[PDB]
C-alpha cells in the first residue's frame, strides 16, 4: 500500500464538499418524466452505443459513429468487435444489477472477460508494468483487488457513495489488475457503481466516458496527482471527477423533459429522415402521430389520413413495420411505437443529438 | 453569571460530522422545486392562518396565556384586540405580514429593519431603541457595535452553503446580545422568519409555509438548554446548537410540504373544513356547491357557475355570491375586483381548517 485506500474527509469550507452536495441533489431528485418508457428505452440503447464508441476511441480505436451505425442497422472487422464487446458489457451490467446481484470480484472478472472477448468463451496479470507510478507486483494484485472490492461494498454512509466512485476509479487503474483492457474495464466499473448508487429511481442516461472524453489531458494529469496517495492529490482527483459527473447529468437530464426531447430530438429526426428521402409524407404523418401519442394503431389513422382508402392505410402500416420504422410494443401485438434504436431513424436521432451537443464525433 | 466575549464567525466542521449531514439534508429541501397545483390566491389564505399559529406560539413562549380558541373567536367575531394580551399576538401577526410584504430573497436585512421588527412587536404595549439598562448580556454601551456586527454578518456574501448555518448563528447571537429592553424573544423569532425569507425558501415554491417557532415550541427546556450550551462560545457548543436548529427546521419542512399537494390539501384540510361549516349549519346547499367550486378551481366568477347552478340567471348567481361575500366566506382577490376566493382566514372556514390541521398533526394545542 504505497498509499492506503481509505475514505477522504474534507472540511466544510472545501470545494470538494461543494461538489459532493451538488451531485447529491441530482441523486435524490424526485422529478419523474413524461416521456413514454418505450421511447426512453430506445434512447438508452443509443447512448449505450455512444459510450462503447467513446471508451474504445480513448484507447485509439479508429471506428466512427457512421461505420458503427452502418454495421448495426443493416448488413465484422476487429476494431468493430472491440466496440460491440463494450456494448454487451453494458447490457450485462444492467441485467446483473437489475437481477438484484452485486459487484463482486468475480463479477468484475466477468466484466473484464466480456470486454476483451464479448459473448465468446478473466484472470489477473502474471507479468508486470511495461509514468511516475509503478503498477504493483503481480503477486500483490489479488490482495489489492480484494481490498478494493470490499471497499466499494462496505456499508458506509450514502454521503460517501460518490466519493467512492472517484476513489474506486483511480484505485482500479492504480492497481492495473489485468494484462490488457484496464481502461475499458475501469469505465465499465464506474458505470456499474453509478447504477448501483442510484442514478438510474428509469429516466436518465449515464455517460461516464463523456466526462473523460471531454479533456483527456486533464484526465491523465489528474490521475498522476492521485498516484502520490497524498491527500491533496486525491482530493483534486475527486473534485475533477464529481464536477465532471455533475456537468454530464446536467446535459442528459434535458432528454427527460418531454418537450425538449420531442422538439429538439425526435421531431427534427423525422424532418431529417424525410429530407433525406428515408420516409415519404404519408410515413412522416404516421410517425409524427406515434411520437405524440407514444404508440399508435391502424384504427387511429382514419382521420390523420382522410384521403386514403382504408386498405391503403393498412398497407402503410405494414410497410413501416417491415422496415422497422414502426415496431410492436409486445410480441404479437398490433400496437406499434417508433423504431429509433434499430432503424434508419437512428441517423436522424444521432443528427439531432449531434446538433444539440450530445455527441463529440 | 458572567459575560464572556465570543467571536461571531462561521463554523467549519469536517465531512464526517453529523452537522454536515443536517446541512446537506436541509440543502435538498432549500433547492427542491416542488411543483404545486394549489392556486396562489388560495394559498394566500392558508399563509395567514399559519401566521396566526406562529404569532400565538411565539407569544405563548414568553408567558401569554390566551388559547387558540380564544384567539380565533377574536378574529372571526367581534373585531380587534382589546385586551393587552390579544394585542401581543396581533402585533406579531402584523409584523409577520410586514416581512412578507417588505423583504424578498437576497435582499439585505438592515439594522433599521430589525429595529422596526421590535417597534411593531411592542407597539401599544424605547420602541425601536437599544438597551440603556447563566450568561450576562454585554453592557448597553456595547450593544450598538454588536448589532452592526450581526447585520453585516447576515448580509455578507458568504457562500450559499453557509446560509442555513447563518440562520442558527444569528438566532443565538441576537439573544446573546439582548439588544432591547423587552420583546427580545418575540423579535428574534421574527428575525429568524426574516432570514429564512432572505435566504430563499419562498422562491422556487408557490406555496411553502415556514413555522420557525414550531421548532422551538415543541420543546422548550431543550431550546433553552441548547442556548445555554452555546453561550459558552466554544466550538462544540455552537455546532450542537446549529445541529439542533437545522434538524428541527428540516423536520418541520417535511411535515409542512405535504400541504403543497392539491389532493392532500383538499381531501385532508379544505374539504373537511367545508363540511365542518356545513355541519354547524353555517352554509346551506347552494353555498356549499359554490365554495366547493372555488376550492377546486382556486377562484370563482359569477359566469363560472352557470352549470353549477343552472336554474339561476347570472344576476341571481351574483346575489348568491354577495351573500357569501357579506359573511366573509368569499373574498375579493383584490379590492374592487369581481373575482373571489374562499375566505379561509376571515370566515367560519378558519375554524374548520384549524380542526383539520389538528387532526392531521400540524397543531399541538
Author numbering:
A (entry chain B): 5 to 79, 83 to 128, 135 to 143, 147 to 216, 218, 220 to 379
B (entry chain A): 2 to 126, 133 to 140, 148 to 379
What is the paper's account of this structure, in its own sentences?
Here, we show that Yersinia pseudotuberculosis secretes an effector, CccR, that can act both as a toxin and as a transcriptional factor. CccR contains an N-terminal FIC domain and a C-terminal DNA-binding domain. In Y. pseudotuberculosis cells, CccR inhibits its own expression by binding through its DNA-binding domain to the cccR promoter, and affects the expression of other genes through unclear mechanisms.
To understand the biological role of CccR at the molecular level, we determined its crystal structure using the single-wavelength anomalous method (SAD) at a 2.78 Å resolution. The crystallographic asymmetric unit contains two molecules of CccR assembled into a butterfly-shaped homodimer. The two CccR molecules within the homodimer are nearly identical to each other, as they were superimposed with a root-mean-square deviation value of 0.593 Å over 340 Cα atoms. Dimerization is mainly mediated by interactions formed between the α1 helices and the N-terminal loops of each CccR monomer. AUC analysis indicated that simultaneous substitution of N13 and K175 with alanine abolishes dimerization. The crystal structure of CccR shows S59 and E63 form a stable hydrogen bond with R203 to prevent binding of the ATP substrate for modification.
